[PDB]
Amino acid sequence: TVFRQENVDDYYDTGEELGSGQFAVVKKCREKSTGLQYAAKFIKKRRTKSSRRGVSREDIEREVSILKEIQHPNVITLHEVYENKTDVILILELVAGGELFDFLAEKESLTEEEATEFLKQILNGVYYLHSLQIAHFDLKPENIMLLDRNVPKPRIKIIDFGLAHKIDFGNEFKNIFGTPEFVAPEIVNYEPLGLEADMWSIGVITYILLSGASPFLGDTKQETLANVSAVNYEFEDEYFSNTSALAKDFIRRLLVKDPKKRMTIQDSLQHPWIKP
């Protein structure tokens, strides 16, 4: 599938840089014809077939195909796609309140109400995705953006679909692998992967929201991965002494090694800590 090959600078003006990663940079932009504002994600293309720099066409097209499908208040929306010899440029909805990761650095720990206010929106977004058989595979606070961080109950949107896959056969067997602190044991063990892997990541996020601490984080990446596989975490009293047993129950039913025994997204929405 080919994308718009006119110069993006003919149609948009860029501004503040919002972030950058290994193969991409995101810049605020403004569409000339409407004055409306977006985030432009420039993804570096692979320059040869056998290279390891840049992102393969197959991987770019999968991300674009998934983004084109989704429209939901808690997921980012794709506006347009451009490309040139060096980059594919996603014109994405602008979400200007920053990462949930940076928001948590400020408060350093949330109440259960503040945590469930965020979590309910994350769960609603993931329920939408899983209903479409889309696994995100990279859920973490860096990939949750706030619309406005200066309100009491910030609204969020899930971003960064670069690892997302359609799961039409119940599982994918692809060596998909994200951030060690958040990946499920089946990712660590290179096993077939399904929607269940996102539910583990939600359990990790929930633990972090409530405590300010990461449940499996070791001193090195290999230690973190070994801890995940062994389900080596505990609810430290110093962090969780005033946290309800029902919140711990929610986490405990997500941080389950066997994916078939883990809570599904529907289970999480009916769990008594969440369900109204």
Ligand SMILES: Oc1ccc(/C=C/c2cc(O)cc(O)c2)cc1
């Ligand atoms: O597949 C995707 C890949 C990356 C993104 C990132 C979007 C994004 C949008 C913003 O408004 C601000 C931002 O800092 C990031 C969204 C989807």
